Amino acid sequence: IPEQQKVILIDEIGGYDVIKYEDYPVPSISEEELLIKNKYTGVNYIESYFRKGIYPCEKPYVLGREASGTVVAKGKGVTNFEVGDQVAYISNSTFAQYSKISSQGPVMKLPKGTSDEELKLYAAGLLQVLTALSFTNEAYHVKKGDYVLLFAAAGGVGLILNQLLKMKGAHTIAVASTDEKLKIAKEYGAEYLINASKEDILRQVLKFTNGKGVDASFDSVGKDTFEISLAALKRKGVFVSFGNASGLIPPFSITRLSPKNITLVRPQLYGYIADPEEWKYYSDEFFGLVNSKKLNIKIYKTYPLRDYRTAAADIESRKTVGKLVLEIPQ
Amino acid sequence: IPEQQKVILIDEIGGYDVIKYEDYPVPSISEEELLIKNKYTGVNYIESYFRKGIYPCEKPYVLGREASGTVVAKGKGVTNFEVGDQVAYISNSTFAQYSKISSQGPVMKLPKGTSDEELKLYAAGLLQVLTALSFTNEAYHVKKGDYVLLFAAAGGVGLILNQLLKMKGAHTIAVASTDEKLKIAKEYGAEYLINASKEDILRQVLKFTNGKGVDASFDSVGKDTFEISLAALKRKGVFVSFGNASGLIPPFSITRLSPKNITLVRPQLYGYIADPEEWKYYSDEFFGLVNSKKLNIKIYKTYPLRDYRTAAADIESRKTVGKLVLEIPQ
Numbered sequence A, B: 001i002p003e004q005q006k007v008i009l010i011d012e013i014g015g016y017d018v019i020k021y022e023d024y025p026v027p028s029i030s031e032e033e034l035l036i037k038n039k040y041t042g043v044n045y046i047e048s049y050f051r052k053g054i055y056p057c058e059k060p061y062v063l064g065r066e067a068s069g070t071v072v073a074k075g076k077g078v079t080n081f082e083v084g085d086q087v088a089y090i091s092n093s094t095f096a097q098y099s100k101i102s103s104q105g106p107v108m109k110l111p112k113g114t115s116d117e118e119l120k121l122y123a124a125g126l127l128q129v130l131t132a133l134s135f136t137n138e139a140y141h142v143k144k145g146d147y148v149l150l151f152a153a154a155g156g157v158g159l160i161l162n163q164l165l166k167m168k169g170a171h172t173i174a175v176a177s178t179d180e181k182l183k184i185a186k187e188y189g190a191e192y193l194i195n196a197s198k199e200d201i202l203r204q205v206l207k208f209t210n211g212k213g214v215d216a217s218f219d220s221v222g223k224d225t226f227e228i229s230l231a232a233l234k235r236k237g238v239f240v241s242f243g244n245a246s247g248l249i250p251p252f253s254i255t256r257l258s259p260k261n262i263t264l265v266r267p268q269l270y271g272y273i274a275d276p277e278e279w280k281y282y283s284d285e286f287f288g289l290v291n292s293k294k295l296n297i298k299i300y301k302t303y304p305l306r307d308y309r310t311a312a313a314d315i316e317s318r319k320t321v322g323k324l325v326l327e328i329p330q
C-alpha cells in the first residue's frame, strides 16, 4: 500500500479550473476501520455546491460521496469484513484510489466473486437509490394514489424516483427541460409530463390534479422552483426540498407554510442511514431491487477519474440523464 | 333582531387602550348563512398578534375566534340548521352579541336541552381542543412511547395537550415559567417538568430522553424557543411550530433542517377542519371528549365581554393557566 495516491480535490472555490487531479496521501486506518481501494465512484450534483462555495468545506477538499472497490487493509478489531471483500459504500473522499471508512459505517459487503460490471452498477446506484428509498419512505411516506410532483425527473435521482413512485402506485407528474428527457422519464414510470422549457408548470400541475394540487413535491431544484412547489401543493401537502440545483432557497418566513398547513422537510441521506439498523434496512433494499433488475440504473457516461471536470461540465449543463460514473485508475 | 349591537374591536394597533367596546351593526346574512346570538366566547392568545400588528388585519377589526349561542336567523337556502338551534362554532367576529357563519362552515348543532353550563364549556373548549386533536393527529401523529416537548404547558392549549398526550401513551416534557404552573401541568398529565425561568432546558431534555432528544416539539412560543427546539429534537424529529408568543421566528435557511432531517410544520387549525368531512371528524371527537369530561377544561376566569381588556392583560402577563372565557349578558 502506497504512501501517495491520485485524487480529485479543490483548493478553493470557483469554476471547473479549480478541479485538480493531484497526488495526495493514502489515509491511515484505525482498529475498527477499512482501507478500500476504489474501482468506481459516482458523480453527484452536490460536488457543485462545494465547488461554488454554496456549501462550506475545509480545503484542500477531496471530492466524492460513494464508491465500490475492494478491502485492502482492515483494523485489528474488524471481523465483519475480510481483506479481498468487494464492497459498496457511502463516504467522503471517494474521488480517490484509496479511502477509509468504519467497518460499522455505511459499507455493504457484496457477494463473493462479484464482477467489475456489477461493481460499476453498485457505484452508479448506491447513493441515488438510498436517497430515493429513504426520501419516499421517511421524508414523505408515499402512498398508493398520491399525486407527486417530481423535478429534474430524468436526472440520476429522478429516474430512480420515477421507478419507485410507479412501484408504490403514485401518480407522478414529471418536470424536465426537454421532450427527449420526458420520454425517458415516461419510460421509467412517469404518468404526466411537463416540459419546463415550454410550459407553465403550475398551470399544468393544477390541470392534472383537478385544481386540488399535489400530495407531495420532491423538489431538488431549490431557488427557482420554491414558489411553484408551494403553490402546487394541496392543502396539508408535503414539500420535500432536497437540492439546490438553481441555487439556495433564500431565508423564508415559516408563516408561509400556514395557509395550507404544508409540512416542510429538507433532508440529507445521512440522517436516514445513521445507525447500523437503518443502514442494513436501506442497503438490503437497494441490493434486492438492483440485483432482481426491478430497478434499472441508467448510466449516461463513464469517465476516467482525471476527467471529472468534463463530467462536472456535462451534468451542470443540464444535458444529461441518469448517472455519470468515474473509473478509478488501478 | 336589533339593527345595532355591541362588539369588541380594534381600530389600530397598540396596547390595551386600543381595545374598544363599541356600537356596531348586526351583520346581514346571505341565503346560506346563519345569524347566531352569542352567549359565550373564548379568549385566545392570537388576539394579541392582531392587536400588536404582528399579524395583519383589515381595520376596524372585530375580535374573536369561537363562540357558543343560539341561531336567531338563517338564509332561505339553509336546511341543515333551524332557528332556535343551540350551536358551537369557529368564526371571526365572535366577540359580539351577534355573529354570522356559513351553514356549511365549522358550526355544530348541539343537543336540544344543552344547559348553560354546557354552552360555556363548549365555548371554553372548542378551538383549543380542536387544535390539540388535529395537531397531534395530523401535524405530527403522536405515537405511544414518543417523548414530546411542550412549551406553554399550563396554558389553554397546553393543558389540553398534556391530557391528550397522556391518553396516547406519550411522555410529555412540560415547559412553563413557574413551579406552580408546572404542578398543574403534572396534574393534567405531564411526566417531566422544566421551569424555563431557571433551568437549562436543553440539558434537562437530554437527561429525560437519555441523550436522544424528543420525538416532537409542540412549540407555540416562536422566536425565543426556535433554537432550543431545534437542538432538543431527535434525529428525524418533528418540529410543530404553532404560535408566536415571543414573536415571529425570523426568516431562516431551510438547510438548517438538514443535519438532523427535521420535519417542520407551522399549522393553523382552519387547514384541518376545512371541509365538512374534516369538520365532522374533529367536532364529533371534541364533543365526545368534552361532554363526557374525559378531557378537563380548566377555566382561569370568566369575564364579561365588555372587560376583554382585562382578560387580554391577564393572559399576556403570563399569570394564567387554562382557559379564559367571556360571558355575554343576555
Ligand SMILES: NC(=O)C1=CN([C@@H]2O[C@H](COP(=O)(O)OP(=O)(O)OC[C@H]3O[C@@H](n4cnc5c(N)ncnc54)[C@H](OP(=O)(O)O)[C@@H]3O)[C@@H](O)[C@H]2O)C=CC1
Pocket (backbone or CB within 6 Å): A043, A044, A045, A046, A127, A128, A131, A151, A152, A153, A154, A155, A156, A157, A158, A175, A176, A177, A178, A181, A220, A221, A242, A243, A244, A245, A246, A247, A267, A268, A269, A270, A315, A316, A317, A318, A319, A320, A321, A322
Ligand atoms: N438531499 C440529499 O441527500 C441529496 C440531494 N441530491 C440532489 O438531488 C438533485 C439530483 O442529483 P443528481 O441526480 O446527482 O443530479 P441530476 O442528474 O438530476 O442533475 C441535475 C438536474 O437538475 C436539473 N436542474 C434544474 N435546474 C437546474 C439548474 N438551474 N442548473 C442545473 N441543473 C438544473 C436538471 O434537469 P432539467 O434540465 O431536466 O431540469 C439537471 O439535469 C441535485 O439537486 C442534488 O443536489 C442528490 C442526492 C442526495
Ligand SMILES: NC(=O)C1=CN([C@@H]2O[C@H](COP(=O)(O)OP(=O)(O)OC[C@H]3O[C@@H](n4cnc5c(N)ncnc54)[C@H](OP(=O)(O)O)[C@@H]3O)[C@@H](O)[C@H]2O)C=CC1
Pocket (backbone or CB within 6 Å): B043, B044, B045, B046, B127, B128, B131, B152, B153, B154, B155, B156, B157, B158, B175, B176, B177, B178, B181, B220, B221, B242, B243, B244, B245, B246, B247, B267, B268, B269, B270, B315, B316, B317, B318, B319, B320, B321, B322
Ligand atoms: N396555530 C394555531 O391554529 C393555534 C395557535 N395557538 C397558539 O398556541 C399558544 C397557546 O394559546 P392559548 O392557550 O390561547 O394561550 P395560553 O393560555 O397558553 O397563554 C400563552 C402562554 O404562552 C407562554 N409564553 C411563552 N413565552 C411568552 C411570552 N414571551 N409572552 C407571553 N407568553 C409567553 C406563557 O406561559 P409560560 O409563562 O408558562 O411560558 C403564557 O401563559 C399561543 O401561542 C397561540 O397563539 C392557539 C390556538 C390555535
